[PDB]
């Protein structure tokens, strides 16, 4: 109830500038690379082995994993500059924009712009432009040059809308068997975006394109975290509406997916991050 995560569009110029600079310090120090690797490591831990489920996606842990993931990243931000909190990209308001590329999140003092088509959609503006920000491939080796390409795939031409979010918030159960991509009437899976997908969380990823478009490499782009803060916010809201609803599966799901299972690559459990206000933060909607 003390660290405030604000809407990106409500940040001051000094807030935008300070957040971007802590991120760059985290990159220069080698700490930011830890999160790219954690995320790529979580994607090849199948629960159980041979399953399409993994520790961080395509199953019930999707939401608590990224909550814990954002929680650590913001802790690393705060250790450099204690004023800094993780902002959230309310992409569902930007979807009403006649041209969402022109939103202030993409301004040159924050995330920088869309990909440049003549340079193969290499990002050449803002603080994470090529030559200012070096990316990493799946196998931990340099791959030179952030890329984006907004709305360029047929399956995700538009950002998810407010009605998408309101509809997801209606779903009555956190998750349902078989706790994977096929789960029906499941808030986790609906928000993750596999209900007639890509929608919501999956749809944003494909919309940004670039590394943001392939899940193992998506945290190469700083907007990933701003994206997932919003996903964490929607979850926070859902938990306050369906108060008498808790995590599922409680047990008898694959190991790593149950309420008290450690979430690879950590020992942190879903129960550990159920209450975000006890984790030290709130969203600027109270």
Q: Helices marked H in 107-222 — which ranges?
A: 162-170, 187-192, 200-208
d(CA 165, CA 199): 10
Smallest distance, Å, CB 148 to its own copies?
21
How buried is residue 187: exposed, middle or buried, by Cβ count under 10 Å (0-12/13-18/19+)? buried
CA-to-CA distance for 23 and 29, rounded, in angstroms? 10
> Closest CB to Cu ion among 77 and 124?
77
**Residue 21, binding choice from its own copies, Cu ion, none, Cβ under 5 to 8 Å by partner class:** none
Say how many Å lie between the first and final Cα of the chain, rounded.
9
Q: How do 3-5 and 281-283 pair as beta strands?
A: parallel
Residue placing its CB nearer to its own copies in the complex, 15 or 137: 137
Instruction: Annotate 248-275 with DSSP letters as a single string.
Output: S-SSSSPTTSSTTS--TTSS--TGGGS-
Give me the residues that bind Cu ion (CB under 5 A), please.
44, 56, 139-140
**Cα 2 from Cα 18, distance rounded (Å):** 19
For residues 171 and 185, the answer to whether their CB atoms sit within 8 Å is: yes
Selection from Cu ion, its own copies, none that 134 binds (CB < 5 to 8 A by kind) is its own copies
Q: Which does 274 bind (CB under 5 to 8 A by kind): Cu ion, its own copies, none?
A: none
Taking the least distance from each CB to its own copies, the nearer of 46 and 132 is 46
Q: How many CB atoms lie within 10 A of CB 66?
A: 27
Please report how close the Cβ of residue 34 comes to Cu ion at its closest, in angstroms. Answer: 14
Q: Going along the chain, which residue ranges are E strands? A: 3-5, 281-283
> Is 46 known to sit in a ligand binding site?
yes
109 assigned to a ligand binding site: yes
Would you say 38 or 224 has its CB closer to its own copies?
A: 38
Nearer to its own copies, 100 or 219 (CB): 219
Contacting positions for its own copies (CB under 8 A): 29-31, 33-34, 37-38, 40-41, 44-50, 54, 134, 136, 138-142, 254-256, 262, 264-265
Contact partner at residue 136 from its own copies, Cu ion, none, CB < 5 to 8 Å by partner kind? its own copies
Residue 138 contact partner, candidates its own copies, Cu ion, none, CB within 5 to 8 A by sort of partner = its own copies
Q: How far is the CB of 199 from Cu ion (least distance, A)?
A: 13
Binding-site positions for Cu(2+) read 39, 57, 66, 201, 205, 228
């Amino acid at each position: 109830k003390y660290r405030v995560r604000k809407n990106v569009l409500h940040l001051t110029d000094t807030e935008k500038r300070d957040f971007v600079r802590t991120v760059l310090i985290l990159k220069e120090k080698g700490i930011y690379d830890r999160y790219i690797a954690w995320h790529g490591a979580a994607g090849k831990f199948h629960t159980p082995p041979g399953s399409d489920r993994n520790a961080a996606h395509m199953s019930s842990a999707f939401l608590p994993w990224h909550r814990e993931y954002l929680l650590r990243f913001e802790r690393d931000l705060q250790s450099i500059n204690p004023e800094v909190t993780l902002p959230y990209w309310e992409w569902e308001t930007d979807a009403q924009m006649q041209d969402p590329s022109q939103s202030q999140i993409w301004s040159a003092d924050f995330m920088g712009g869309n990909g440049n088509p003549i340079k193969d959609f290499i990002v050449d503006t803002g603080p994470f432009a090529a030559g200012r920000w070096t990316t990493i491939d799946e196998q931990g080796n340099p791959s030179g040059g952030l890329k984006r390409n907004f709305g360029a795939t047929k399956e995700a031409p538009t950002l998810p809308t407010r009605d998408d979010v309101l509809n997801a918030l209606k779903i009555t159960q956190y998750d349902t068997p078989p706790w994977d991509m096929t789960s029906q009437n499941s808030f986790r899976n609906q928000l993750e975006g596999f209900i007639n997908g890509p929608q919501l969380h999956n749809r944003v990823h494909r919309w940004v394109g670039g590394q943001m478009g392939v899940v193992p490499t998506a945290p190469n782009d700083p907007v990933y975290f701003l994206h997932h803060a919003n996903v964490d916010r929607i979850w926070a809201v859902w938990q306050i509406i369906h108060r008498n609803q808790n995590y599922q599966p409680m047990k008898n799901g694959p190991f790593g997916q149950n309420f008290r299972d450690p979430m690879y690559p950590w020992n942190t459990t879903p129960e550990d991050v159920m209450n975000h206000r006890k984790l030290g933060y709130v969203y600027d909607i109270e």
